[PDB]
Specification:
This is part of a larger assembly, with 28 protein chains of 7 kinds. Chain F contains no helices and no strands. In chain F, 0% of the residues lie in helices and 0% in strands. Chain G starts with a helix and ends in a 7-residue tail after the last strand. By secondary structure, chain G is of the alpha/beta class. The relative contact order of chain G is 0.24. It is classed as protein transport.
């Protein structure tokens, strides 16, 4: 369900 | 990174 | 009040295209072997 | 046990190859023999966090 | 992060 | 749009 | 001569407005954008090579072929003995949603889903079969059938 | 009993394959042997809620 | 040199107006719209082979 | 890689890279060459395949950065086509893959 | 407040192209041996 | 202030060309012997 | 009678 | 998730 | 959610 | 437009 | 966009 | 220096 | 030279 | 993760 | 002040040509004997 | 031990040739037998800093 | 851009 | 004199 | 000539 | 690292 | 010892020929047998300053 | 620009 590119701390 | 991803995943799973 | 009319026009434009796409039926093709 | 390395990774599925030459494909939550159940698949870093704490990564002689 | 349902579900602040 | 996907 | 130096500085800023650092910045941003664009939403379908037994008796449900948009799903037709069963003809309903490649002699059909979730059906008249084989093609599933071995009930020309 | 997995699912119908190799197709309310009657067919999650409480999902080695 | 940095920020916002997260947002919305468009109203007919 | 054509076996994955040539040679279980009868490339806008019609070797160059797809390879003596999934932009690039088909 | 409209227009122009790219599907090619 | 927009315009003109150059991929060539 | 795509909690 | 779907289905069944 | 009759029939609030 | 559909 | 890349 | 995540991460001052 | 590169690398690794 | 061209003391 | 801009323009005009010359690469020629 | 020289270097990977004629390729963090683990790959200078303090450079009769 | 080139 | 790094590094005054 | 070249070279080496 | 042509005493 | 003359010189590399007919090529800092290590390569004057103080120039019968 | 040319 998670797309890794939209990752932000 | 990984902690943020897992926290967001559990937030999405708890809040459908 | 005018934003309601603009929204309705936008969704009318979308809905006519959607209905047109639904109306399309591609005729079947029969392929004969050699 | 059997050690699993990432053969390829994309958002979602991850193709893994073990020490026996077997090929597997896993998703966000999916059972892996010995490694437990997949918990996360970081496609950008090529990492896979599993439930048992073991991390699957690209093979050292392959990445 | 954004879910497969179309809605946004993002973590607050997590670092490692 | 669900969380169990 | 300081005019020459500062004119060259302004010159080299105008000729190459992107610094060597900002060039790698832009390249990384472009690659990240391409990765986001090419990333599939959700889990990609699991690539499975399945085997089904085609029962042609009335009341039986036609076999389901799990497709995926832009991916090739190959159906090979075999008789109950597992031998190849060549294809006499095929009939594709809604051929705007599926593209079928098949050399006219073999028994293998290669279907690519042109549309995301539009499903249809397909008729496959085999060589020695009077009863056509009916299949339902459904794309956009949690599994993608790379290859399906359809074990038709009858006995083909190969024993 | 006989365990039924989802072979394919779309809004409405759902094609299931059991442990015997049998294939059925079910709708919003439809009798399934051993699993009771279909109560809901969630096509997005690939889930099927039945009246007996048993949930039909894609096979573990198929999704 | 801060002019260069802030000009680069404005430039990269203008060149890629959709963030990498917004791109997956848009892709998911598009796939959801296609799913809704291709969904059959009601129960699809049961595929039967009768005699 | 060893290609297992039995049902339930995962199709082999080929690691590509944009602008790089990846060559698959198809061998039987004895390691001998297995010439290619035909091939079928789904999504041919993201992969370019070069293959002289006689040999057993395919050369794919990934046209797109991270767009992955699949490919069917019908060999000479094989009724069952060989299915592969081609994924570019990985941390490894397969310059050459030796595919040991089951037959 | 006008920057809002400008930004929305920019990402709409990007998104139309992005959706158009996503709708594109190249038909498969079958190559026969000699 | 206006120099900022001028600089942004120059770097955007550079960046579009750079992205276009990166998008280009020359297809492989197969040269058969005699 | 329900289409899951129009789902809202 | 499914709770809302089932509640809406029963609402539609009771209110034709 | 909307029924096959053309009329809207939706649940109020249900979280899973 | 009914509920027993 | 992480640091363990 | 700028990272592969797209974010800038630069050192302050270091001479060799 | 390399001192700045290593310091920037460790800054990037500590701050993902 | 480091590209040497963007090097500066 | 204006001579600064004139000088910068002159050097830019020279540099465009210089970079264009540096970008040029003449492809190799293979000459076969009789 | 075995001495490793740089055969070629680019941002990221670096192809090295040892004293036995063996050829390897190393990345930012990568194990090199005898030299430890790669710590930095300076492509402009053609240098490779490893964890053991040994620096891998182009061969004297090759650069 | 270093001095050890 | 100007270095291969792109920065200028020149001597002050030296005659021979 | 050569003295200035060597001085500039050492200035560039000391100041990277 | 030094280009001889850019020489100046 | 062995006397080395400049056969050709450019900014950077310099091709030298010794008294034995051997041909070498040197860079800004590079070991030369007998002359030590290259300290500077003046391409305009056709001179090479080495660490041992010996200067390599075009041969008198060649310049 | 040197005198030992």
């Amino acid at each position: 369900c998670v797309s890794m590119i939209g990752g932000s701390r | 990174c990984t902690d943020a991803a897992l926290a967001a995943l559990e937030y999405h799973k708890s809040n459908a | 009040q005018q934003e309601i009319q603009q929204r309705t026009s936008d969704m009318l434009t979308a809905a006519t295209q959607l209905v047109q796409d639904w109306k399309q039926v591609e005729t079947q093709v029969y392929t004969e072997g050699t | 046990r059997i050690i699993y390395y990432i053969q390829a990774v994309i958002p979602g599925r991850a193709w893994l190859i073990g020490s026996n030459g077997s090929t597997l494909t896993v998703r966000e939550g999916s059972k892996i023999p010995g490694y437990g159940m997949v918990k996360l698949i970081d496609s950008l870093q090529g990492r896979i966090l599993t439930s048992s704490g073991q991390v699957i990564k690209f093979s050292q002689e392959d990445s | 992060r954004v879910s497969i349902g179309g809605t946004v579900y993002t973590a607050k602040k997590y670092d490692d | 749009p669900f969380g169990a996907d | 001569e300081v005019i020459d130096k500062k004119a060259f500085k302004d010159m080299t800023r105008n000729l190459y407005p992107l610094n060597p650092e900002q060039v790698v910045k832009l390249k990384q941003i472009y690659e990240t954008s391409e990765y986001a664009k090419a990333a599939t939403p959700g889990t990609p379908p699991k690539p499975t090579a399945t085997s089904q037994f085609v029962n042609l008796s009335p009341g039986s449900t036609p076999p389901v072929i799990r497709l995926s948009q832009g991916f090739v799903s190959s159906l090979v037709f075999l008789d109950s003995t597992g031998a190849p069963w060549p294809i006499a003809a095929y009939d594709l309903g809604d051929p705007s949603s599926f593209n079928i490649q098949w050399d006219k002699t073999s028994n293998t059909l290669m279907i690519q889903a042109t549309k995301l979730y539009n499903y249809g059906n397909l008729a496959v008249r085999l060589r020695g079969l009077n009863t056509p084989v009916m299949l339902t093609l459904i794309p956009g599933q949690k599994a993608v059938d790379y290859r399906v071995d359809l074990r038709v009930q009858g006995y083909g020309p190969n024993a």
